[PDB]
Amino acid sequence: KPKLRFIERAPLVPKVRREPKNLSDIRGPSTEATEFTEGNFAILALGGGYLHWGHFEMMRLTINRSMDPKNMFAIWRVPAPFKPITRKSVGHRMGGGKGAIDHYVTPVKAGRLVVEMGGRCEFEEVQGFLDQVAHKLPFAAKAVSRGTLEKMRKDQEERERNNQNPWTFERIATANMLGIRKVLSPYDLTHKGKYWGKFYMPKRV
Template structure:
């Protein structure tokens, strides 16, 4: 699973997801992309399962770019623990997603294969997504 090698702080605040994504909201590498329509958190397991779904559908043809990285730690207290006694230990890593963020990009395959692969990947995620295409303007 994806996780950072080193972080400045072990535990961070939850924060709030407000507003649209400005950075990372346009297609930069591929021809087709999966775009988030609402905010949410994407765990490292969800990033990996969506990547596997894309690669299986494309049958190792083409190229895939993952545009998100889980750099925010989530903490969890042990089961059957009373309230209080501070914040729990770091448990997993998530990527905070804003509406408009490009999650995956694909190139080197036909349009119908790319749309099918990205749609399957979107079904693995806990928020609404849509497939977009980069139209070449001559």
């Protein structure tokens, strides 16, 4: 089964309890599926967002059509949509209770791998359509191999080490210099200024 598996619109057992939109699941760096597993190429999420069944279908169809099943294999690194999103009826005034469940999404945090590909192939063969998929994803994304991912991580570390600016967001936030914690968020103490909402500023040091 080398080709990418089908993803269902909603969980087979539908959720009954509406749940709050905890945007923290999109906010911040990703702590899961951040490393390669049984593959050499992948789509890395350089930002946060929700993946709909439409995005899943786009990824599946594009990758399946453009891959070589006898020499390439692909695997999801993101679960099927599970978080329920509720929409009220059009023309409804505010109030009257939380709306009924409309769709299911899967939260994705910046720094996570969405699809992982491997097999008897090199990056150049796959980067084309992986970049197509990444550009059509709801969040900033990039086709990255193991080597390129390590290269970008080492480049970030090098920039952090050799930055000539005496002042860093990390230092100022941690020390509460200028009383900037009045303007910053408690999450900023760990985001170090590299994350703003769902957006991940990669050039930010």
